[PDB]
Design a protein around this ligand. Structure first.
Ligand code: 7Z6
Ligand code: K
Length: 130
């Protein structure tokens, strides 16, 4: 479906989420993935443009003339791979699987990746939990 947006244009309600769903399908089938992110010896395949669109750290890395060519990126080995996995899934779905057992790891990983809206959200859920 579509609607008449704030401008004159026709706007498609599900378009952006459909694009993201299709990018996640590509990721799931390893189609056009162009980088491996390595965390504590676990490898995660992804699309650089999606990483950059969601993360300040990945934005800085891939706009750098030297680093934009890298097909492998190592993160700080103190990073929890589960924390990374949760944020990567978020990037491709808009859904953040936050819970008691993981929220601290997720918040620390989001801070490192410069995902400021996720960091704020984590703060609110920790602050309410106290
Ligand atoms: O009108 C349109 C818009 C459109 C987008 C895409 N792109 C993708 N589709 C899927 N899966 C569904 C699919 C697979 C194979 C054939 N048909 C549909 N996964 C990933 C991507 Cl990137 C494919 C076809 C069409 N047709
Ligand atoms: K670790």
């Amino acid at each position: 479906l579509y609607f008449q947006g704030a401008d004159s244009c026709i706007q498609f309600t599900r378009h952006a989420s459909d694009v993201l769903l299709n990018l996640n399908r590509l990721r799931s089938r390893d189609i056009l993935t162009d980088v491996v992110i390595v965390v504590s010896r676990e490898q995660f395949r992804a699309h650089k443009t999606v990483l950059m669109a969601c993360s300040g750290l990945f934005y800085s890395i891939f706009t750098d003339q030297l680093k934009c060519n890298l097909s492998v990126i190592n993160l700080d080995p103190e990073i929890n791979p589960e924390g990374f996995c949760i944020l990567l899934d978020f990037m491709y779905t808009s859904r953040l699987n936050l819970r008691e057992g993981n929220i601290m790891a997720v918040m620390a990983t989001a801070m490192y990746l410069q995902m400021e809206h996720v960091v704020d959200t984590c703060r609110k859920f920790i602050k309410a939990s106290e």
